[PDB]
DNA sequence: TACCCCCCCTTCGGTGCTTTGCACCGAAGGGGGGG
């Protein structure tokens, strides 16, 4: 007998309709059983050509875990819905969850099934899962109670979600608690055994509630505390060639737009000649303290770039080779929030697409733990070999934007 | 006494109103058979005949079935259709005989008149109003509305796809061994059962269908092979295509090539080897369809040989999914790619072919990349499952190519199929600068104006030269610049350019390109044995960069 | 003088860095096929 609060588009824009791309045989058959159970349980309902919209459906197997999942592609509705923060609905980002030792990440959007959805906004909901070899239509369904992977449903949630946390909260004030989309962040500073003993305890907590008032028990352990950022570096050398000091220089004068400071007019001056690339040349008296001055300003942080919570986050990432892969948080150009690398993933040495799509998960969660955002990301990568393989390795509950770049290394900037 | 099909609410796209278009003019022989048509209708409950208080039209017209003496009526309801509220369509695809498991009994039938078995919103019916010219425009003629969902209008086909569905609901939940491919109106219906308790399983289909008004004529119920469906051709263990008629004609058009093109391009999914980048090259161009266009000796060479495949009768298999897939590609050339896909050798679910061209400048591996992506894909839409392939290319071309390519790129389970022309890597630019090659620091400018330039090189051993040139730009003159540097160098050579864009280009080992310049460039590289390129700034004194920068700018 | 789906080949305008030229990509309009 609960009562939905009303949810409403942005002014001056129509619903989602993104066409349905293809499933394999397992994620159909996956995906058919979890939606005949779903609509027994009153879940969703059969819907009509007459619902013109759509978002693209499909599923999802977490780290280490058996048992399907499904993911909405909703992506395009979230950009369309009401923005909460204006409501004031919109959940606060905790400064402190970075600052843990420890941080959990629960798999909580079950809960979201429970509370019912605005009857006028559910036709936005609509997906078809589609058949092998095209031997039906498409079966075409919408929700009726709050759906994973909508930013609607935790803004809409965050009441009972507040009150039932609030026992656990009062017990144990050192531990944060930040919820993000299906998701649950919980972060300590308790030695480990102490922290998985406290998200056990968190856990059955939750069941209480689930029996008075994808599964649950999951959780994934991040250590905050211990982020490393990867800077710009010069190479050091006692010799270096023609070639060495073209390629400093070039890198030094592609610094120059994040750092003001450096300078290139002694170094510059060493290449006076047409001189042979494999030609080595001593560093004149002038040059070396350039250069030092230069490792000076580099070692210390750009002036004038911090955050801006209206601004979007977006990140850049370089096939460095080798299984390395880099990568920049900005919200604006050369004023990066992070930089950092990755090495050895999933995939290294076989599979660019798996660790392409390990680090986009990877600095996605950075984003949530560090802003509370999720960023936009330039991907090294052409649009249609990313499309053909990256469900096959996602392994998370919401979907960042993104959108496909080509950007030949000129200088090796960011790995040596 | 039948089960009517509960009505779809549809709505006019917001603040339009109905269609308000009057009746073209109607050739004598025309009027007449339409007349006709409109009191059937009304006998069988399929329309009404009000029209005091309508106030709307839409022209109506008719044309007849293909070798057919009917005739179909048809509604240029497309006022209504830019009108009327967007529609969800619940088509996703075709079903392909490919993949099909094979079944011991088989029916094939259509549902008779079908989309005036399927009764239109009751509130929408007004719009669909319209009128038929009584003698020639002598006195008023009739005013009709649909009953039913009427050929012309947009939410017909999904309307009465998506009631056909939930009609053959309850069939297949208590059918469960049963396999029914709805596409249309046009059933398929197979089972492992007895052809008896089969024929049974038809008839009971056909009651429950006639239970909800859905009828299913036995001139239109196959009952023996060779099926006919969806274009195609089925037997008990093989299918195929239904006959492609090709045009032999003496004189060819733009029109003839586009439809010539275009039927190669449907058969090319079972006839293996199909080619048609020639005949599609003499398309290119504004030409319109009327003009006439004479073959090139290439040309009609590819014509020819199309022709030797499409002599024989080819066949494809049905899909086994105990058996492994298996993908093949075959280098054809100037970027044509064939395939195969089969599970046990020589039989043939079907074939295909890639030939797009995308990108000014690339390479046969991001082609045959690209190749093994559509295929992957129309495999996920057939079988849902992505096939083992067997492709023309060394494993450590593989290597070599994705791994030192700066884009991520990969390609799944695949092994080597030594079956030339071969994949191959045409160069290699060095990782680090050459010992003992002459550095060769390049550069060009031209003046946006004049549209006159010059490119030119200075050397560590003092050799230099300077062309001038005509009719050109800024980045054609750099790209020039790095052809001189490697036309006068030896066979191992550093170059030292400022062009992000020339180096952008020949980093990614293109072996092909639309400009002749860089074809020029991609051959020279091909003879050398040793390049080592190297960006530096421009207008940052360094090296022979500024002392190049002022030759071809003055 | 119609509608809905899928496919390939070409052209063309919009978009963003390779910049004021050039490269990429999607839409649209031609063809094949289905009902
Ligand atoms: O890969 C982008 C590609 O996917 C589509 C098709 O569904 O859209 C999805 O991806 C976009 C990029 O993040 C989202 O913005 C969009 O909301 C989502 O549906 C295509 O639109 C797009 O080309
Ligand atoms: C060919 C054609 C068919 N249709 C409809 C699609 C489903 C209905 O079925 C038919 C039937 O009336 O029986 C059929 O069996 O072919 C007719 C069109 O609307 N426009 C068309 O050009
Ligand atoms: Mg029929
Ligand atoms: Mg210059």
Not at chain 2, 195 to 218: A, S, V, Y
Request: glycine share 6%; with cysteine; charged share 25%.
């Amino acid at each position: 007998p609960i009562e939905t609060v009303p949810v409403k588009l942005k002014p001056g824009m129509d619903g989602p309709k993104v066409k349905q791309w293809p499933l394999t045989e397992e994620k159909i058959k996956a995906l058919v059983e979890i939606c005949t159970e779903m609509e027994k349980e009153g879940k969703i309902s059969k819907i009509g050509p007459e619902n013109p919209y759509n978002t693209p459906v499909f599923a999802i197997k977490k780290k280490d875990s058996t048992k399907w999942r499904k993911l909405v592609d909703f992506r395009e509705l979230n950009k369309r819905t009401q923005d909460f923060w204006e409501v004031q609905l919109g959940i606060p980002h905790p400064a402190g969850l970075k600052k843990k030792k420890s941080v959990t990440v629960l798999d909580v959007g079950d809960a979201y099934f429970s509370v019912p959805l605005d009857e006028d906004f559910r036709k936005y909901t609509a997906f078809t899962i589609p058949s092998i070899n095209n031997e039906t239509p498409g079966i075409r369904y919408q929700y009726n109670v709050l759906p994973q992977g909508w930013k609607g449903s935790p803004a809409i949630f965050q009441s009972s979600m507040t009150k039932i946390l609030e026992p656990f909260k009062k017990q144990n004030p050192d531990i944060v608690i930040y919820q993000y989309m299906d998701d649950l962040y919980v972060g300590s500073d308790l030695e480990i055994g102490q922290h998985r003993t406290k998200i056990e305890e968190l856990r059955q907590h939750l069941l209480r509630w689930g029996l008075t008032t994808p599964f649950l028990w999951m959780g994934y352990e991040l250590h905050p505390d211990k982020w490393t950022v990867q800077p710009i570096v010069l190479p050091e050398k006692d010799s270096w060639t023609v070639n060495d000091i073209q390629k400093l220089v070039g890198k030094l004068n592609w610094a120059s737009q994040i750092y003001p400071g450096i300078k290139v007019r002694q170094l510059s001056k060493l290449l006076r000649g047409t001189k042979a690339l494999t030609e080595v040349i001593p560093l004149t008296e002038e040059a070396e303290l350039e250069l030092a001055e230069n490792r000076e300003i580099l070692k210390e942080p750009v002036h004038g770039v911090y955050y801006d919570p209206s601004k979007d986050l977006i990140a850049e990432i370089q096939k460095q080779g080798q299984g390395q892969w880099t990568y920049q948080i900005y919200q604006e150009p050369f004023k990066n929030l992070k930089t950092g690398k990755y090495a050895r993933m999933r995939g290294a040495h076989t599979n660019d697409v798996k660790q392409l799509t390990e680090a986009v998960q990877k600095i996605t969660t950075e984003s949530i733990v560090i802003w509370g955002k999720t960023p936009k990301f330039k991907l090294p990568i052409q649009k249609e070999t990313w499309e053909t393989w990256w469900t096959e390795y996602w392994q998370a509950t919401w979907i960042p934007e993104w959108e496909f770049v080509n950007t030949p290394p000129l200088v090796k900037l960011w790995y040596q | 006494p039948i089960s009517p099909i509960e009505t779809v609410p549809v709505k006019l796209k917001p603040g339009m109103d109905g269609p308000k278009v009057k009746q073209w003019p109607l050739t004598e022989e025309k009027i007449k058979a339409l007349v006709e048509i409109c009191t059937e209708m009304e006998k069988e409950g399929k329309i009404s005949k009000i029209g005091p208080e309508n106030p709307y039209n839409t022209p109506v017209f008719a044309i007849k079935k293909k070798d057919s003496t009917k005739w179909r009526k048809l509604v240029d309801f497309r006022e209504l259709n830019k009108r009327t509220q967007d529609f969800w369509e619940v088509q996703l695809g075709i079903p392909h005989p490919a993949g099909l498991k094979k079944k011991k009994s088989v029916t094939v039938l259509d549902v008779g008149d079908a989309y005036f078995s399927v009764p239109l919103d009751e509130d929408f019916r007004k719009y669909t109003a319209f009128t038929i010219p009584s003698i020639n425009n002598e006195t008023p003629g009739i005013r009709y509305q649909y009953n039913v969902l009427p050929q012309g209008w947009k939410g017909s086909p999904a309307i009465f796809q998506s009631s056909m569905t939930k009609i053959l609901e309850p069939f297949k939940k208590q059918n469960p061994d049963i396999v029914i491919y709805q596409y249309m109106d046009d059933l398929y219906v197979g089972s492992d059962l007895e052809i008896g308790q089969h024929r049974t399983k038809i008839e009971e289909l056909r009651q429950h269908l006639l239970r909800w008004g859905l009828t299913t004529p036995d001139k239109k119920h196959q009952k023996e092979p060779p099926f006919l469906w969806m274009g195609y051709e089925l037997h008990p263990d093989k299918w195929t295509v239904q006959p492609i008629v090709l045009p032999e004609k003496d004189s060819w058009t733009v029109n003839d090539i586009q439809k010539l093109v275009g039927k190669l391009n449907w058969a090319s999914q079972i006839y293996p080897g199909i080619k048609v980048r020639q005949l599609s090259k003499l398309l290119r161009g504004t030409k319109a369809l009327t003009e006439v266009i004479p073959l090139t000796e290439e040309a009609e060479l590819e014509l020819a040989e199309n022709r030797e495949i499409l002599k024989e009768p080819v066949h494809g298999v049905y899909y086994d999914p105990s058996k492994d897939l298996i993908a093949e590609i075959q280098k054809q050339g100037q970027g044509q790619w064939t395939y195969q896909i089969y599970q046990e050798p020589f039989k043939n679910l079907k074939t295909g072919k890639y030939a797009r061209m995308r990108g000014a400048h690339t390479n046969d591996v991001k082609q045959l990349t690209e190749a093994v992506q559509k295929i992957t894909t129309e495999s996920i839409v057939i079988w849902g499952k992505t096939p083992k392939f067997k492709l023309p290319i060394q494993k450590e071309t593989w290597e070599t190519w994705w791994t030192e390519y700066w884009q991520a790129t990969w390609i799944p389970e695949w092994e080597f199929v030594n079956t030339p022309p071969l994949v191959k890597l045409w160069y290699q630019l060095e990782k680090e600068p050459i010992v003992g090659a002459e550095t060769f620091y390049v550069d060009g400018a031209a003046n946006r104006e004049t549209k006159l330039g010059k490119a030119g090189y200075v050397t560590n051993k003092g050799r230099q030269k300077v062309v001038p040139l005509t009719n050109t730009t800024n980045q054609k003159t750099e790209l020039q610049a790095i052809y001189l540097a490697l036309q006068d160098s030896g066979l191992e050579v550093n170059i030292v350019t400022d062009s992000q864009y020339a180096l952008g280009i020949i980093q990614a080992q293109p072996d092909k390109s639309e400009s002749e310049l860089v074809n020029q460039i991609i051959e020279q590289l091909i003879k050398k044995e040793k390049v080592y390129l190297a960006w530096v700034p421009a207008h940052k004194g360094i090296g022979g960069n500024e002392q190049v920068d002022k030759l071809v700018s003055a």
